[PDB]
Design a protein around this nucleic acid. Structure first.
Ligand SMILES: [Mg+2]
Lengths: 50, 100, 49, 279, 195, 50, 55, 218
RNA sequence: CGGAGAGGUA
């Protein structure tokens, strides 16, 4: 969706946009594993364990 | 609903006036795009002819900076509401959480 | 495609050893000033160095 | 000397998730064809999308009674409606329901040449038995993305207050995932396969999309060469077009009993602008 | 026919006035200027290029003179009218005529932040890479080799070059030999002029 | 803890993935960082400034 | 393509009288209909005038 | 109008004198500029029929780091003049030639044996320089037919055969405006050849090859 | 087709 300039990070030292980018991808990966268990039928027993 | 937050999103959203916090608890009797009707409990009702609670959600209006200011209900019929719960999401609000 | 990640900023392996050695020096060189050997002005010009 | 590819297999993980395979492929032709087909499947692919008039509304910024959602929100979720039409290119659906309960896509009309891909697509929610909703969903067919803001010509026709324009997003393809890899031995090495993994909103067929993008690609590669009373008075004399009436002078038209007083006055008014009836 | 007729035509925006506007825009320079005009290099002349949208495009090489980044900066446009104003825009304040600062003879069209990194990646020299230790017949063969995915951009390879030298009295001695270089540096030689 | 969160779902622990070109179908070297960032839209539009 | 005026100003090293002589010359081309001493490629009087003094 | 895509009108075809052209396709749709421009670019370099030099052996030298008296160049240097040589070959697959000559002066392509079907396109191409009246040069050049570029490591002295008869290609997408539309591409292709085939005809070659790869779908 | 004050952008 967005193509940012990577050279703007070392000039103005704002690393919080690098950890949020990694943490935001991690948060989406836990939302894709549940979406897979919701797109197809899955018992609540499997959803309560993951 | 930003995935990466600091936990201070509900505090700003609830303390602001853009949302519609439930005054007294109960069960949603009639939800609507512009009105909210919740049947208050037997204890939370005043002794002499208390009745119910009615929340009139604001429609599309303009702000000081010419921005849209409208609310949207986030409840359903039969859902038991407790005192302090959020009943509507105004501008930049997602289920009682700030989202800009 | 020259990106920038969290692993592209490597911390030196002996950084912890230099800081631990530095705080150990200050923990005893400050007490040498309290004995009346050096003044507070010259000690200030020494800790910053 | 080139082993042309063939449509070998078409997998089907679900009603939306597909996986096609293109083999055999030569050296440097996997990425050459994989990218070229991806750039067409995403850009231009025909589809259908909602382009709708509700009874008790005047604009999308209003609000109706007995509906939990908002009028603009209703126009927002109607955008994501998977419709499939094979007969014509312009259909008008209808949605009528009353009583407490959600309003899904099943409740919409059951036209013969209209197939609903996701009947459980929630569109609205009713919250009062003494309420009802009635709308006419005008579905069309096109390609690409066309916003409602571009429909400001105001030189073709005018729309009533009841009409509500919606953003047209008739593009069934969502994402394309091809991947080149080494094929089997085939008694000849240096042969690679192309495994395309597409995904759509159940409104198109995998084969019907690859045979269509390749057609568009070949259609561009061919550029490889060097270089009524007034009108009834004139229609009585078998004259329907303005050219037949303008061929004769106004004096010749006035010498006939077929022309009336109103027709002669209308012809004189049109002739005053030096546009017609100039002898 | 009349002045009023032309106004209604532009008012309705016929499809023909667009090809008529392209006529005057072709050779009519315009002046661009930002708010903090400190030196004279803040008002230059450019040739307008019609583009769809509501934003102005400014060459990323004159941004150093204007001192304008792309975080919300705005500039003001000006259109000369008379013949003298148009000629002064081309012969005195044209963007391709003001490349040296009035304070020092050093250039002011130095690119940065994407051109100096890119050329540094081509001119880089790796130790072990696909294609190390080969022979290329010139810079044209190097471009064919790299785009084909057969050799890396930074790999040592002996390449033959023909570098002209205009140091004589108009004559250009075409020295030809085999220089030791990489793939990236060879492809960049196709841009370097003769002299 | 971010890397451990990237190990629950099937995601690369390094954080940087390998992308392909969209106009040439080529593979970019030095695999880039791709994630999910929360961007905002300031009330500075070009329609109110042109 | 009137990209630069280097070769033009090298002949007459003033950069001020050139604008003056070109303004008068281009005005005689526009004001009164005439054929430019040089062929035209859908250019204006300003470009044609500077192109004429090039020789 | 669901399948009514615009067609380019190549109104301008400018080319340098001998082996350099510049084609400008206009107008194209949005996104087809890079689509079509790169499709033929990858094929032109990586899959293009042609003949080049594969291996040349010296009658008295069996090592790369050697030298022969009377030659102004080196044995490593004369390999380039064999690579840059462009030869058109008949339907025959391969054929070996020689460079038997003893004389003072530069060795041009005209000194190579005719060998019948072998037709040299650049007789002015110089292979090496000789200065002694008795220094004789002799080698065995072996041509071969292939598609693409084959380096030395992918494979008597080896020669990196450049079968592709195109020296370079670099397209450039631009902006073209219809009466009302403006966001449409404008492809500009620049390409140089090696003199074997004209660049104008070289486009029709790869475009036909790509058109034949889409027969099972259209 | 104004005068002061406040806030914001480069
Ligand atoms: Mg700025």
């Amino acid at each position: 969706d967005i193509v940012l300039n990577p050279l703007g990070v070392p000039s103005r030292m704002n690393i919080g946009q690098i950890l949020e980018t990694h943490l935001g991808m991690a948060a989406k990966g836990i939302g894709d594993k549940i979406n897979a268990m919701l797109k197809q039928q899955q018992e609540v027993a499997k959803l309560r364990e993951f | 609903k930003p995935l990466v937050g600091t936990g201070m999103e509900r505090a700003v959203a609830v303390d602001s006036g853009v949302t519609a916090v439930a005054k007294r608890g109960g069960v949603v009797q009639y939800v609507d795009a512009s009105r909210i009707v919740i049947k208050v409990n037997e204890d939370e009702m005043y002794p002499g002819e208390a009745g119910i609670d009615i929340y009139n959600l604001t429609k599309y209006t303009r702000s000081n900076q010419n921005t849209c200011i409208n609310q949207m209900p986030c409840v359903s019929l039969g859902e038991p509401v407790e005192r302090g719960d959020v009943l509507a999401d105004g501008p930049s609000t997602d289920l009682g959480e700030l989202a800009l | 495609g020259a990106s920038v990640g969290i692993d592209d900023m490597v911390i030196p392996e002996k950084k912890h050893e230099i800081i631990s050695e530095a705080e150990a020096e200050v923990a005893e060189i400050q007490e040498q000033f309290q004995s009346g050997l050096v003044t507070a002005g010259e000690r200030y010009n020494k800790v910053i160095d | 000397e080139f082993l042309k590819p063939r449509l070998v297999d078409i997998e089907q993980v679900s009603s939306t998730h597909a996986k096609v395979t293109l083999e055999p492929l030569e050296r440097g032709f996997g990425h050459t064809l994989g990218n070229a087909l991806r750039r067409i499947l995403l850009s231009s692919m025909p589809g259908c999308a909602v382009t709708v008039e509700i009874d008790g509304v005047l604009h999308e910024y209003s609000t109706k009674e007995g509906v939990q959602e908002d009028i603009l929100e209703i126009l927002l979720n109607l955008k994501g409606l998977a419709v499939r039409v094979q007969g014509k290119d312009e259909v008008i659906l209808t949605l009528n329901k009353s009583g407490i309960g959600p309003v899904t896509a099943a409740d919409i009309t059951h036209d013969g040449d209209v197939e609903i891909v996701k009947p459980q697509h929630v569109i609205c929610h009713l919250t009062d038995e003494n309420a009802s909703i009635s709308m006419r969903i005008k579905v069309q067919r096109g390609r690409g993305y066309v916003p409602a803001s571009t429909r400001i010509h105001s030189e073709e026709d005018e729309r009533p207050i009841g009409r509500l324009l919606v953003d047209a997003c008739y593009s069934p393809v969502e994402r394309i995932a091809y991947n080149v890899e080494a094929a089997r031995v085939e008694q000849r090495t240096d042969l690679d396969k192309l495994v395309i993994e597409m995904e759509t909103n159940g409104t198109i067929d995998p084969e019907e999309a690859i045979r269509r993008a390749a057609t568009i690609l070949a259609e561009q590669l061919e550029a490889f060469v060097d270089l009524v009373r007034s009108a009834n008075c004139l229609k009585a004399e078998a004259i329907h077009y303005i050219g037949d009436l303008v061929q004769r002078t106004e004096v010749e038209l006035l010498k006939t009993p077929n022309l009336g007083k109103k027709s002669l006055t209308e012809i004189k008014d049109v002739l005053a602008s030096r546009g017609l009836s100039l002898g | 026919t009349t002045i009023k007729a032309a106004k209604k035509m532009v008012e309705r925006e016929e499809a023909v006035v667009w090809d008529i506007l392209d006529e005057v825009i072709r050779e009519h320079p315009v002046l661009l200027n930002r708010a903090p005009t400190l030196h004279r290099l803040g008002i230059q002349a450019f040739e307008p290029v019609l583009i769809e949208g509501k934003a102005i495009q400014l060459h990323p090489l004159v941004c150093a003179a204007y001192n304008a980044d792309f975080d919300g900066d705005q500039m003001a446009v000006h259109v000369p009218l008379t013949l003298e104003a148009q000629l002064e825009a081309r012969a005195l304040m044209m963007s391709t005529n003001n490349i040296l600062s009035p304070a020092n003879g050093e250039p002011i069209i130095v690119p940065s932040q994407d051109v100096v990194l890119g050329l540094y990646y081509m001119t880089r020299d790796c130790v072990n890479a696909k294609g190390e230790g080969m022979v290329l017949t010139g810079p044209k063969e190097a471009e064919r080799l790299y785009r084909s995915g057969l050799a890396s951009l930074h790999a040592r390879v002996k390449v033959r070059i023909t570098e002209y030298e205009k140091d004589a009295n108009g004559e250009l001695v075409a020295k030809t030999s085999l220089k030791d270089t990489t793939v990236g540096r060879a492809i960049l030689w196709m841009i370097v002029p003769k002299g | 803890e971010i890397k451990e969160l990237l190990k629950l779902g099937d995601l690369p622990t390094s954080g940087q993935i390998r992308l392909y070109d969209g106009r040439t179908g080529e593979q970019f070297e030095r695999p880039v960082t791709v994630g999910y960032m929360y961007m905002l839209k300031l009330n500075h539009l070009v329609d109110d400034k042109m | 393509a009137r990209v630069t005026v280097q070769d033009a100003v090298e002949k007459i090293g003033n950069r001020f009288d050139l604008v003056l002589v070109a303004a008068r010359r281009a005005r005689q081309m526009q004001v009164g209909g005439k054929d430019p001493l040089v062929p035209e490629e859908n250019d204006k009087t300003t470009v044609i005038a500077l192109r004429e003094i090039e020789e």
